[model samples]
Target: EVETFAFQAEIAQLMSLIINTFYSNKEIFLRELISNSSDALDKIRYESLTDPSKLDSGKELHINLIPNKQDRTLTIVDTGIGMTKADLINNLGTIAKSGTKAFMEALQAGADISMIGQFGVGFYSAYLVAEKVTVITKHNDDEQYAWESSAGGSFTVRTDTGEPMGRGTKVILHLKEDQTEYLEERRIKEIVKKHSQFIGYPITLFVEK
Candidate 1:
């Protein structure tokens, strides 16, 4: 069972703006994603303080950066508090409703858009490099679900029948042809050093043998 949802008019406009205006600074996409996954990891840790089972029997907390040159995809996987379908809609689709105007103001003011995290619009930064994004997430209380969007205008959420995932989220970015530079380990390491050097969790980059 799959359901499709449209991004609000403002979100569509904002995404287009990001895709166009931030073309030169495309690497910020990785920074935003790492920050978000770190936040999710933090949330699960905090939640587990009250409900111990939220840890899913002591699963390791970490993030993995996987790059596939053959597939032209980069997948960011985290062991954290995953999202339900509603979360996917609200967090990824809505763009924080009222915050759209502020994002636009900053964009117009020529302010560094690296501050997009402050407005909760950082996830859309994936569109800065990916032509399509797939989010597979599983929350402790809900079934696994997969959300996919091309950053065109809408996205889809459906029951994920693949191998069952533990509580966490996997964000897979299908890179645009020219954006394949992200598939390199050296580039990823450089970006991680610049933005996530101090992140508490281990961020492992899968090196192909």
Candidate 2:
């Protein structure tokens, strides 16, 4: 059976704020996601100090961007610290415990969009362009599962019997009709270069010729 969950009161309000207020420039969504991806990789990198096996084995830690123009999808894959189902519920479901502020004071003081996700709500910024966001992740500690959410704020999670992702998280963005600009490989390159070029780990873009 699929499990259902609702956003916290503060989260519902914050979700509206992000899609309507904070991000007028929708391109910032990629930067926020890439920042969070780098953060996840850093977590794994830190874990490697105690258990070296946690760093994707022979794979040099990296993020992969696969943009499928045919399907109109952009999948951000990272061999980072994969999350268990509980982690997904807490991280993506709730606003407060996801590490987001009830109302961030730092943002209010300086009005910095870069500091927008100091509370961890950066994931929601995906809604700026994607009508639906699907996350399929496999944590070595648990079985693979899929989490789906529309911009509506509530979401459902179900154990997926499909092929596992091997490890880490894959975020597949189902782009909105008007958001087709994101599928352009040229545009993606420019955004990654401008915002994520120095993001610690390598971010490779996979696009068809």
Q: lDDT tens digits, residues 15-41, model 2?
A: 566666645578878988888788878
Off by over 4 Å in 1: 93-95
Q: Which tens-of-lDDT digit does each residue in 88-168 have in candidate 1?
A: 888553447677778878877987777887888888889889989999999887889999988788989999998787888
Position 15, candidate 1: lDDT: 80
How many backbone clashes are present in model 2? 2
- Please estimate how well model 1 matches the true structure, expressed as its whole-model Cα lDDT: 0.87
lDDT, residue 195, candidate 2: 74
TM-score of each: 0.94, 0.87
Candidate 1: residue 57 Cα off by (Å): 5.8
